[PDB]
Amino acid sequence: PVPSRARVYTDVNTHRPREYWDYESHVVEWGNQDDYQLVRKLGRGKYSEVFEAINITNNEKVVVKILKPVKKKKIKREIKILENLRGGPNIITLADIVKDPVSRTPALVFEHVNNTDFKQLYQTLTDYDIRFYMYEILKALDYCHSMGIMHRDVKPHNVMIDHEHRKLRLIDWGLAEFYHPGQEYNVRVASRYFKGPELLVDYQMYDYSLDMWSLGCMLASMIFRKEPFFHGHDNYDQLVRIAKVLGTEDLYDYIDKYNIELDPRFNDILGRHSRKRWERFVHSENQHLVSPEALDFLDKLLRYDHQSRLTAREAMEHPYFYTVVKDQARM
Template sequence: MSHAGAAIARNKCRAERQSSLGASPWTEDLICTGTCDKRARSLYPKLTPHDIKFYLYQVLKALDYSHSQGLMHRDVKPHNVMIDHDKREVRLIDWGLAEFYHPLTEYNVRVASRHYKGPELLVDDTFYDYSLDIWSFGCMLAGMIFRKEPFFAGADNVDQLYKIAKVLGTDLLNDYLDAYDLELELEVEQRLGTLPRKQWSAFKNKDNAERCSPEALDLIDKMLRYDPAARVLPKEAMQDQYFEEVRKQDSGK
């Protein structure tokens, strides 16, 4: 199957999943188009496991809404999530790289900050879609859960793909490349070599153990996948067991 043909199949599958889920209620003030000068900008060390769930659930709401409006953010990262810890408010900011999604349209791969770039950007898959935001969100989630920020800390784009492959392995990368008729440059292929996949539990240690619940690791796994079509949708993630407590509180408002 050609690259474009694979993109058609991927887009159709995603559209069917999105349609079956329907639109979600939305609190519009979660999206802020300005700079949103909030006091608490980087609270990772202070956040409890419940705080992480609460704030990330709100970010998923923002992504679900923007995607339902046809808009890809394309620069999801911690610095673009503004938190007012006292007011328990969240803003997803900096929509300067946002773009409306149109099926079978090629997009510039020079978007997103390096440590949050999806594999599709790193292998020049120009037919990417909303799932790029889910990869970036997954990187953010992994960084918070494992207390390792950024989680994939590449020195350049090739090294970034290498850092990803050191975790997800090269077998699944090759499966993704084959499925979408993509090829790596020879120097990149040689840099990666052959790498085994690691289990998410391998990143658990005494400093992050309280955050590394089976539900958290499972959600990370659903987001950080090479194949964009295999990644969970924002609404699916919001229904995940990891967010059960927060979801109940949210529905009770």
């Protein structure tokens, strides 16, 4: 299988001192859990439970993510990633790290964030707001990509939004990792529906461009008002749903170019499928959310070859965002 290197931000970690990305060596400076009191539970998941809390020394509202038991190196990874990304635009801001008195697990203290995520609104935004928030998500991905980090779990549930203040934050960096050219990565990342083809075919030498595919899936879901857009019933079917849209021609080309192996009995199931036109998924209901710019943008995101997808910066420069960058910040 042919090796691959990111087209952008290729060597950003290489040009930084090892301390930046060598998270196993990172020495955690713990804060004091006694300075925070938990107010109410906001949610619970595989790896954490999330609480509203208060910094008692100054009454600041914060959000606390208490990690469930996990290998230390993954905890160190998320912490170091979060610390390197502090004050990046639209990325959740880590304010402190404490140990849970009870479980003894690390708990991450974040700037306050609204408890509404980008799945609760985003089947109802205007055309203008979809462009607006899409651009805000792009700032966070360009930023984290520029800092040598792949998020690897982009999806609506991982973007919190405060629509009334038009603020958004990309959250849940528990699956993120540092990009190093030549490194092979776990392909068991992302929710099925936002998994890029490279993950579906077990191609391990992937990069930031994985996030750009997931972003395209969110965009498709929003403008076509279908959630999810690629609704696979298992990992194989996810690729089949994709191939039914992008066609099999470009898929087989992609597999060849990286010398990817495809279980030949899966190939029999995929067969051949025509590349469909995006216009195919337009209906009276979603008409107003679609435009030529939107479809061109979507087309340049949802590409099999990861090397061919728009970079975050290229996407920020796409005509889809031409006007929305002139936003006059009305609340």
